[PDB]
């Protein structure tokens, strides 16, 4: 490998001479302490290396060693139930050998090199292997981890190890060429993993949250952005998606958050339970954790590591959900890195290539046919935090241009303690037109038209606000008081959900369809009674209001009996009325 010596030290910038043959953007180890850095410029015999960590104490003449590879992650068994930083350093193993502080120059491995795994071969000698096929399986918690050949490797199998206990470092398959395949391989974080073909979105990503995946659904493999201010629910919704979605593996990325907020996430997450099996939620999630005082390079590269791990788990045939918390803090690190490189700014101080990076990050999602012949998907949900609620900042326009859904939060509904606090007037979704051939085959034939009727009822209430803000609410006509009351019923009994309840935390499509049918059955009969001619106050007092309200807290397996009872009850009550 290429080895040189330091020639000039000035802040984080180091000039090393004797480095002829080193390649651009390689990872180098600087000094006797082993500080890591990247080569950013080549000039003759010298190379410019930008050191990640603190450089105080370095001297001229200390060795510089090039690893010869760009920034990459180790992909293999042992990533689940793990906590990593932005450059895939296991924090738990760092804590054991160092204490409460992170000393500079510590060396650890992403995958444990001494843990034994249960090997089970699938290929036999004489077989031809191409990139993406399965060599064998290894059990890991509730899953079976498939051992994949790297995508750039092809050849014929020479020898296969028998079944037994092995570590990740021992070769299991060796080809006729002489290349030895281990249980793990490395891949650059900035290069997308190849696939065969990208399929269309035609299956919904069930979030379990009534408003989110009834009014503004997101398809499997889609993208969504959820901006909002403090106390608006951003975090509970995310962790609720982690708890209740139909994704097999969850990847959580935190880019440069506050320390006391990463503390909450790191402490609370091991205490949650997986609703599928009752085991810990940690057994199917990977967290990337970065605070504000970590090096800016790790904060900038945090999301690429997460999306690469999500792509690796997608390549095994799973369905992966990726949650990127506060991409604005990633854009801040990008701005800082661009400022240190002396590049020209654009708009609000951001580098001109911000939109290109955001487009390159969001484009990795989608449902694909993997190289192994199996389907997989990655779904990305990215949180945004505007500086003052103005969606005119550059990051929000750059996000709005590419995302397929937009869940706008509002603190005004949080002030009224109405959760989820989602502004249904400013939100939108572009996956509704391609999802209803799934809805009217697996939910109910009348589901789409019922959804549009409910949306129309919600819209008609909003068009009467300039009446109520001038004239008192009680003075209105019967035909308008009726729609105001049905709007209140929708806002309080359908668009409201409790995540801490035993049964209300998760809602299925049949239950939501039943509730919507129940509400429309109430509304049509109240309207017909209005032309029949009755006191409006008597309608607002009828006992079927309790049947409307108490439909939320009924259990999933006992809902249909309640639905049929309420269906007969509303008719019986409105026939009893004069």
């Amino acid at each position: 490998m290429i080895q040189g010596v330091i020639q000039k030290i000035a802040g984080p910038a180091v000039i090393a001479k004797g480095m002829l043959g080193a390649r651009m953007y390689d990872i180098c180890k600087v000094g006797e302490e082993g500080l890591v850095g990247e080569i950013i410029r080549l000039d003759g015999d010298t190379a410019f290396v930008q050191v990640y960590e603190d450089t105080s104490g370095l001297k001229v003449g200390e060795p510089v060693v090039s690893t010869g590879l760009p920034l990459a992650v180790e992909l293999g068994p042992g990533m689940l139930n793990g906590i990593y930083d932005g450059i895939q350093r296991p924090l738990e193993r760092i804590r054991e050998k160092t204490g409460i502080y992170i000393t500079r120059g510590v060396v650890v491995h992403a995958l444990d090199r001494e843990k034994k795994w249960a090997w089970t071969p699938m290929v036999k000698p004489g077989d031809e292997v191409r990139g993406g096929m399965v060599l064998g399986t290894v059990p890991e918690f509730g899953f079976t981890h498939k051992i994949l050949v790297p995508p750039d490797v092809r050849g014929r199998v020479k020898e296969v190890k028998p079944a037994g206990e092995y570590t990740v470092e021992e070769p299991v398959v060796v080809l006729e060429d002489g290349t030895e395949l281990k249980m793990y391989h490395t891949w650059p974080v900035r290069r997308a993993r190849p696939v065969q073909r990208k399929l269309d979105p035609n299956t919904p990503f069930l979030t379990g949250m009534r408003i989110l995946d009834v009014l503004f659904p997101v398809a499997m493999g889609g993208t969504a952005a959820i901006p909002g201010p403090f106390g608006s629910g951003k975090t509970v919704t995310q962790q609720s998606l982690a708890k209740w979605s139909n994704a097999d593996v969850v990847v959580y990325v935190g880019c440069g958050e506050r320390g006391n907020e990463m503390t909450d996430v790191l402490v609370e997450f091991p205490e949650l339970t997986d609703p599928k099996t009752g085991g810990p939620l940690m057994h199917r999630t990977v967290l990337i954790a970065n605070t504000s005082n970590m090096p800016v390079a790790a904060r900038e590269a945090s999301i690429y590591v997460g999306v690469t791990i999500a792509e690796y788990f997608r390549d095994q045939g799973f369905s992966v959900a990726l949650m990127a918390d506060s991409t604005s803090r990633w854009a801040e690190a990008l701005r800082e890195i661009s400022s240190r490189l002396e590049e020209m700014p654009a708009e609000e101080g951001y580098p001109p290539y911000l939109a290109a990076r955001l487009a390159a990050f969001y484009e990795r999602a989608g449902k694909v046919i993997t190289l192994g012949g199996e389907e997989g998907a990655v779904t990305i949900v990215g949180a945004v935090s505007p500086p003052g609620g103005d969606m005119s900042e550059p990051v929000t326009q750059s996000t709005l241009r590419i995302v397929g859904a937009f869940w706008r939060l509002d603190a005004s509904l949080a002030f009224r303690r109405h959760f989820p606090a989602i502004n249904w007037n400013g939100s939108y979704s572009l996956f509704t037109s391609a999802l209803d051939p799934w809805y009217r085959e697996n939910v109910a034939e009348d589901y789409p038209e019922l959804r549009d009727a409910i949306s129309e009822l919600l819209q008609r209430e909003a068009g009467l606000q300039e009446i109520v803000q001038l004239v008192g609410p009680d003075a209105l006509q019967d035909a308008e008081r009726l729609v105001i009351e049905v709007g209140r019923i929708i806002r309080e009994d359908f668009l409201q959900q409790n995540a801490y309840h035993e049964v209300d935390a998760y809602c299925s499509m049949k239950k939501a369809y039943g509730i919507m049918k129940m509400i429309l059955a109430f509304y049509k009969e109240a309207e017909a009674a209005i032309k029949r001619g009755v006191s409006i106050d008597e309608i607002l007092q009828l006992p079927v209001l309790e049947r409307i309200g108490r439909a939320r807290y009924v259990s999933e397996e006992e809902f249909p009996a309640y639905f049929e009872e309420a269906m007969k009850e509303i008719q019986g009550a409105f026939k009893a009325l004069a």
């Binding site: 043959g21 953007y25 700014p345 001109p352 390159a360």
Partner: protein
């Protein structure tokens, strides 16, 4: 023909690299860059001098080193091989097929930058196009040879309007008594910085209409190299000019979301440390945009025509 290689690389930084002894590289030439691993990159000469020649790389410079990199000359001017068989095909903006079919056999090789049309050789556009929209056909009518862009917002359906105009376009020869025949119609569709969800809509609309048999598509995706976005409209306009002025076609060119083109141009300009303009954009955008829009029109003594409908989203 022989090939010549240069190995005197002396400086690599960002998108630029310097070659020492390359005194016989023409200005604006296309070079072919090879590294030690065998991966092949492209580039263009942006400045040539006795001491060194400056080459910018079409994509990222990861993996290059001063010991093993070599630069090879391809051609003195960027050219595209055009043919009458390009109809019904799809290309990735740089000119390679992405439909899985074998590549074409070029009848001619034309420079992609084009040449200005002589104002004496032009003639007045006078043929009215009926589009089927009252707000257009009556108050903003479109003429063969006109360049009429659509100013759109973020969530507004500009693409549906463009597709509807492409479907319903007709010339109405009966109002002037100009016979019954149709001089053949063609559509050239160029997409810069488009997403898969949107591109699928255009693909399905063209398949449903059946207009794919007389259309050429140049597709540049959001994860493609940023330079390939710059070259995308020029090759589409080269193909349209070739068809219209050598085979008497009436072509219709649709350029989608030129805001992506302008941001790509801003990236490329700011990568070379130049004096910026009104909002960080380069100060020479007017000439660069004029070299794209001005290629449409009608020519005296010829039957073909080029009509442009660019689409851009107002920030």
């Amino acid at each position: 023909l022989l090939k010549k290689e240069y190995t005197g690389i002396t400086y690599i930084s960002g998108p630029l690299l310097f070659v020492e002894n390359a005194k016989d590289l023409a200005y604006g030439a296309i070079v072919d860059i090879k590294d030690g691993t065998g991966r092949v990159r492209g580039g263009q000469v942006i400045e040539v001098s006795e001491e060194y020649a400056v080459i910018q790389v079409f994509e990222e410079t990861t993996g290059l080193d001063l010991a093993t990199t070599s630069v090879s000359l391809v051609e003195d001017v960027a050219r595209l091989g055009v043919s009458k068989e390009m109809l019904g095909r799809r290309f990735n903006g740089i000119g390679k097929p992405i439909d899985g079919l074998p590549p074409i056999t070029p009848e001619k090789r034309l420079p992609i930058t084009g040449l200005p049309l002589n104002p004496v050789a032009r003639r007045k556009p006078e043929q009215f196009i009926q589009t089927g929209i009252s707000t257009i056909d009556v108050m903003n009518t479109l003429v063969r040879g006109q360049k009429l862009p659509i100013f759109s917002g973020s969530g507004l359906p500009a693409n549906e309007i463009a597709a509807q105009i492409a479907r319903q376009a007709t010339v109405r020869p009966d109002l002037s008594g100009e016979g019954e025949k149709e001089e053949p119609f063609a559509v050239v569709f160029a997409a810069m910085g488009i997403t898969q969800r949107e591109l699928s809509y255009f693909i399905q609309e063209f398949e449903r209409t059946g207009a794919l048999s007389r259309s050429v598509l140049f597709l540049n995706k959001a994860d493609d190299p940023t330079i390939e976005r710059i070259l995308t409209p020029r090759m589409a306009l080269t193909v349209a000019e070739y068809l219209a002025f050598e085979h008497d076609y009436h072509v219709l060119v649709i350029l989608t979301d030129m805001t992506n083109y302008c941001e790509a141009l801003r990236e490329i300009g700011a990568a070379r440390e130049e004096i910026p303009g009104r909002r960080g954009y380069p100060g020479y955008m007017y000439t660069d945009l004029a070299t794209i829009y001005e290629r449409a029109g009608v020519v005296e003594g010829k039957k073909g025509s080029v009509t442009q409908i660019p689409i851009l989203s107002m920030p």
